[PDB]
Design a protein around this ligand. Structure first.
Ligand SMILES: COc1ccc(-n2c(=O)c3c(C)c(C(=O)C4=C(O)CCCC4=O)ccc3n2C)cc1
Ligand SMILES: COc1ccc(-n2c(=O)c3c(C)c(C(=O)C4=C(O)CCCC4=O)ccc3n2C)cc1
Ligand SMILES: [Co+2]
Ligand SMILES: [Co+2]
Lengths: 381, 381
């Protein structure tokens, strides 16, 4: 049941912005770890005296990494005279964000038809404003509303190349890495209470609850009209034996924030081979592979879709598999991206639900929880 | 003339400690960019609730990367109950350091015979104390005095594996990278006034002025008794046409600090090949190569030591060459290591002055300034 109640016209995920202390080093580690190319820059070399920002791209995926410069470089400017290419940026907000959360996502940015209209209708429907709409070089407008914790939902709209003031990077510096990652699939938040978060976000966007099918969570998924912008949210469930990983998140993160980003790959086997090659030489580490019993019980549950050739290929890479009633899903999780046990990345491939592929095809692999658990028990036996 | 006036027994450079906002990402970028192996860790997985610290090693070189966790994790501890493996660490000092300077060196640590004695004699001779001597697991003692800006000189002494509380890292995670880098050669500071800095540091260490032979600088080199611990210091020279890079440093860094670390390589040609391979895939970038005229004029100045086979091999890699009267030196500079135009790295090889090799053999390549300049002019002609 998809009511299609978007209060404004939403298109697709546009970019994810990371607030760091040093954008150069984080950007280079991510570039190598995920196979993302250096696409554009705004920094001292482009006249930006306020913040350094570097964009990585892989297919449609856009990762933005930003860190502040000393405020002394831009003490003489005023908001109308600013050299910052992202007008919402603020030194104190950024330093406070990163000292409070460490490395994490500041903005989930979606492209819309009219950013100003999306901001106005949003706040008229209960959104807490973060930065009012601003028009950039009469060409793009950007506005921000609060999403949860210190994460903002950023609206971007174009009249007619990332953002004004940014520059394309030199051919030399830009090496054409690509491990198969193609676009952002969903972005997930951890909150203390799911109800008020769901009520709040649904209420200013009009996103509807996405169709679902006893460890830690309780979650829900808001989705846009075409279900191409998916925004899951988790809350912890207390009093269990194994303490909630969601509560672990909230303690180390100092409150709500973005938990994981799910990236879609065209060939999840090539992605996971190439990412695993680089794990111990600067890239990313993966959550430990599930017991061989798990793969023994996969025949009986996904026999019709996965040949054991493609199946044993998942065993090599430790991939997890789940299926809904319309589709099937391949997924694996990284270890946390930084010092704290907070944000991590999911690589996914969806097969099914062709018409183009419809969003959420296969679900989000929640069954994999119980399945994994069962496997563990069976492999101990 | 080497007076050998060390006020206490100094051995060698022990490690360099980096204060960052996220130690994981910086460590991984450096590991891949310089070919340093992951050696030890102190973090949540080792019981450290205060700070995450990761050590990289290449030969004798030890790079330590540290970032704070949320203070909430260790709000119940007191200094006697701390879980921090580096007792000098302080959340507010670290956050203030990194918001003020960005990524940079916090500690230059030298090994000595008795850290307590080195601290006491130091402060009795004018050193500003930073952290008093502390004994760790009845085995190692660490003490800190101020060096310049917010950089400290750290004394380390062992009774008899990095530091107590640290753990050796898993064989898997630890990939045996090595591009030839073998030890730290010198660590250089930029200050507003060279005289008071020289007076101050010489006065509490007893380090003597190292033997020397019109662009930006004015510098001097303090050295220990055997001249194996070298501590150059620069100040800016104003009023020139091209603004001092030292003054550029001080403005963007928000005061004095460490400008560059010089790392010695066993084969500088292998190091520079392997580092250059990785420049655009997560590693480091290099200062643009000097004009071919520069290499034309090299025959006439280093003909006796460098064969043109080894010489044209420098042309490939852009290496710079200088010579003193006792030795010869090969050197090249990276672009800055982070967002700000502050800290950078020098790779060097010294050939000459055998007996073991004596410190400073070849000097520090200051002649290369004028030489480079001349070359530029000649290549324009
Ligand atoms: C080896 O030890 C392990 C291995 C794996 C796990 N695990 C996850 O963390 C995990 C996640 C985070 C999702 C997920 O994607 C997410 C939901 O949970 C909430 C709604 C939508 C959504 O996107 C799906 C399955 C998962 N599994 C099996 C724990 C311990
Ligand atoms: C292509 O544009 C360029 C290329 C290169 C340079 N340059 C440096 O930065 C540079 C440095 C930093 C040292 C050095 O190591 C240092 C001293 O200067 C102070 C005392 C001891 C010490 O260790 C030696 C030679 C250098 N040269 C030619 C500027 C602009
Ligand atoms: Co997911
Ligand atoms: Co040098």
């Amino acid at each position: 049941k998809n009511p299609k109640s978007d209060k404004f016209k939403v298109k697709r995920f546009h970019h994810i912005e990371f607030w760091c202390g040093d954008a150069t080093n984080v950007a280079r580690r991510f570039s190598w770890g995920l196979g993302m190319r250096f696409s554009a820059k705004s920094d001292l070399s482009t006249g930006n005296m306020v913040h350094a920002s570097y964009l990585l791209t892989s297919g449609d995926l856009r990762f933005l990494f930003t860190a502040p410069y000393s405020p002394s470089l831009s003490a003489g400017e005023i908001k109308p005279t600013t050299t910052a290419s992202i007008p919402s940026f603020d030194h104190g907000s950024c330093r406070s964000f990163f000292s409070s959360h460490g490395l994490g996502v500041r903005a989930v940015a979606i492209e819309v038809e009219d950013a100003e209209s999306a901001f106005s209708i949003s706040v008229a429907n209960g959104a807490i404003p973060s930065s009012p709409p601003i028009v950039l070089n009469e060409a793009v407008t950007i506005a921000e509303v609060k999403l949860y914790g210190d994460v903002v939902l950023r609206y971007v709209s174009y009249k007619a190349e990332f953002l004004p003031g940014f520059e394309r990077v030199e051919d030399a510096s830009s090496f054409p890495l690509d491990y198969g990652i193609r676009r952002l699939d969903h972005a997930v938040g951890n909150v203390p209470e799911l109800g008020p978060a769901l009520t709040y976000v649904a209420g200013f966007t009009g996103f509807h609850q996405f169709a679902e099918f006893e460890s830690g969570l309780n979650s829900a998924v808001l989705a846009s009209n075409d279900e191409m912008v998916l925004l899951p949210i988790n809350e912890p469930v207390h009093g269990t034996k194994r303490k909630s990983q969601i509560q672990t998140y909230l303690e180390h993160n100092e409150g709500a924030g973005l938990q994981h980003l799910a990236l879609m790959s065209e060939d999840i086997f090539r992605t996971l081979r190439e990412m695993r090659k680089r794990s111990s030489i600067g890239g990313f580490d993966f959550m430990p592979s599930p017991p061989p019993t798990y793969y023994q019980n996969l025949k009986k549950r996904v026999g019709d879709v996965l040949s054991d050739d493609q199946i044993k290929e998942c065993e090599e890479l430790g991939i997890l598999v789940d299926r809904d009633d319309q589709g099937t899903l391949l997924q694996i999780f990284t270890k946390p991206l930084g010092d704290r046990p907070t944000i991590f990345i999911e690589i996914i491939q969806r097969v099914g639900c062709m018409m183009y592929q419809s969003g959420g095809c296969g679900g989000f692999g929640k069954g994999n929880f119980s399945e994994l658990f069962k496997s563990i028990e069976e492999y101990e036996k």
